[PDB]
């Protein structure tokens, strides 16, 4: 990077035909060297995709870009909303397969964020990421050099060959393009399915684990609420065991797969909360699902509860089923009292459906008290259960009941 910067510094100031030709040749050589270095780093860091799993290599891992900035509740893109954002994503262009564009330069300001306890060699990974970012910035420093590199990448036909696709995915991971990596993973999964082994239409499997991880990372990075909800519903129904985009290293084992559903649900809830079209049911669902981050999430949940307050005519089939956190139950109890809404509500499992079937009276109050006592006893019986099972069960029930209600 230092040599490239010194060369560019001398090249830009000098304006001559021979100087321009020398600068172009140096830029081409530097681009080739950077590509070779990125390929070597990709091969050394994780050669699991390079050869068979039984072959010797380092510890398996999967790369995913952090979406902490995008997932922020306060950072709501109310100016564009969903329709304009979707139109911008389409870009008034065909939906056919395309690549070799590189319409972003966030790698220069991007930095690798990872916990030192997660991997001993995390410093080396961060240094390699910084070097790759510097090389990409040097390549994109000159418009002509960037155009030549894009033309070379397009002529390479990365989407044709499997090895070319793997190289393109490694280059995209080094730069930051998650879409190219997702497309390469999908192509690899399709190629694996084309083999004599059994094939499925993108179903959860060990062979398609990389594709599922890439899809989850893309869903988390993007603000697509509908896609995240669909992915969460599919996973629940059939489960298988600063500024700019950031980067992080996470294990590729089942530990990351298990929290993917919870992360997707949290991202969907955050997107729904940040949506302009606020609703009482959506606010309550977001508040129930907001017990993942604090203090912004707690403030958002409190604001949603205050906005809802004593709506009364609220539609909810399994609102209590998804709630597992004690904070949501405490907030609902506080809202039900005279402080928030001063109106009775339902909190037992499937209490809303039962309450809607008959008028509230002394007998109905006694029945609700008995149901609450039974629910408390059931909770005490299995108090050690985590919220992941509750969220998965609620998502599965919602998918079984009213999947077609979406859109």
């Amino acid at each position: 990077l230092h040599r490239m910067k010194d060369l560019c510094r001398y090249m830009n100031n000098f304006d001559s035909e021979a100087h321009a030709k020398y600068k172009n040749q140096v830029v081409y050589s530097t681009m080739l060297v950077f590509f070779k270095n990125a390929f070597q780093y990709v091969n050394s860091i994780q050669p699991s995709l390079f050869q068979g799993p039984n072959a010797p290599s380092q510890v398996p891992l999967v790369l995913l870009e952090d979406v902490s900035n995008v997932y922020g509740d306060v950072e709501i893109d109310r100016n564009k909303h969903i329709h304009k954002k979707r139109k911008l994503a389409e870009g008034r262009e065909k939906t056919m397969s395309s690549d070799d564009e590189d319409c972003s330069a966030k790698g220069r300001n991007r930095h690798i964020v990872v916990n030192k306890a997660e991997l001993a060699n995390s410093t080396e990974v961060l240094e390699s990421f910084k070097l790759a970012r510097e090389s990409w910035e040097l390549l994109y420093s000159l418009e002509f050099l960037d155009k030549e590199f894009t033309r070379i990448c397009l002529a390479w036909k990365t989407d044709t060959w499997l090895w070319l696709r793997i190289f393109l995915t490694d280059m995209i991971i080094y730069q930051g393009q998650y879409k190219k990596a997702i497309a390469s993973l999908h192509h690899l999964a399709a190629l694996q399915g084309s083999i004599s082994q059994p094939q499925i239409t993108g179903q959860g499997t060990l062979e398609h684990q990389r594709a599922l991880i890439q899809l989850a990372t893309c869903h988390f990075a993007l603000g697509e609420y509908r896609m995240t909800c669909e992915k969460v519903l599919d996973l629940m129904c059939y489960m298988v065991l600063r500024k700019g985009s950031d980067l992080k290293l996470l294990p590729c084992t089942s530990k990351a797969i298990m929290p993917y559903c919870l992360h997707l649900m949290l991202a969907c809830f955050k997107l729904r909360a940040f949506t302009d079209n606020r609703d009482d049911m959506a606010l309550g669902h977001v508040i129930v699902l907001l017990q993942q981050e604090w203090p912004r999430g707690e403030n958002l949940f409190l604001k949603a509860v205050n906005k809802i307050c004593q709506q009364g005519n609220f539609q909810y089939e399994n609102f209590f089923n998804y709630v597992t956190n004690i904070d949501m139950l405490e907030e609902f109890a506080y809202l039900r009292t005279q402080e928030g809404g001063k109106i009775h509500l339902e909190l037992l499992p499937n209490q809303g459906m039962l309450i809607k079937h008959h008028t509230v009276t002394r007998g109905i109050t006694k029945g609700v008290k008995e149901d609450f006592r039974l629910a408390m006893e059931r909770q005490v019986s299995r108090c050690g259960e985590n919220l992941m099972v509750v969220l998965h069960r609620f998502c599965i029930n919602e998918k079984i009941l009213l999947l077609q209600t979406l859109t």
């Binding site: 604090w294 409190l302 904070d327 405490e330 907030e331 402080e339 985590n386 919220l387």
Partner: protein, 204 residues
Amino acid sequence: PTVVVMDVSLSMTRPVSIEGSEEYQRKHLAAHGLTMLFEHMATNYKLEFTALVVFSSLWELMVPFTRDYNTLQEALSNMDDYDKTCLESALVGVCNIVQQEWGGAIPCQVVLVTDGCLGIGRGSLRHSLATQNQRSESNRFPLPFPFPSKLYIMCMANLEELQSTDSLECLERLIDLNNGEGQIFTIDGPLCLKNVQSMFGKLI
């Protein structure tokens, strides 16, 4: 020469975020109380007596007149709650009862154990009561009464649960009500609560 108050609120039944320190509901522990400290205080202070009086919004009674506190505690159980969560009125009534009973010349301390649940933004009106010289509108504010009294609230919970349920925020507001005339713990999270045992030992 002491007062013991136990909270049996339904909110305390649920855990902080997942479970408790002792893998049990906080409300059950609160109802049971500090067994070791209470037993030590009872055994060491054999010549100590106390009475329980409950009055929040209306006159009521559940434990008959008896010297033994164990009988009163047993009688307190198996009772139904009432739709009332008054704080300022309950505190005023307790202060009035204390003033009527002990007078203004008997040296004694009054301690009330109350959660003091409130809200953020919506429940901002509570600040007016805590401030005596709050402009000309609150110039004729009876609170605080012209007598020696103080209110203290002690609790421990996780940071996320405290923010969500306004547990630590209520304690901070109560401390700020008396112009910060007290100490505030700096530790937070899954840290233990050994300070209670030290306080009990120092007091006896």
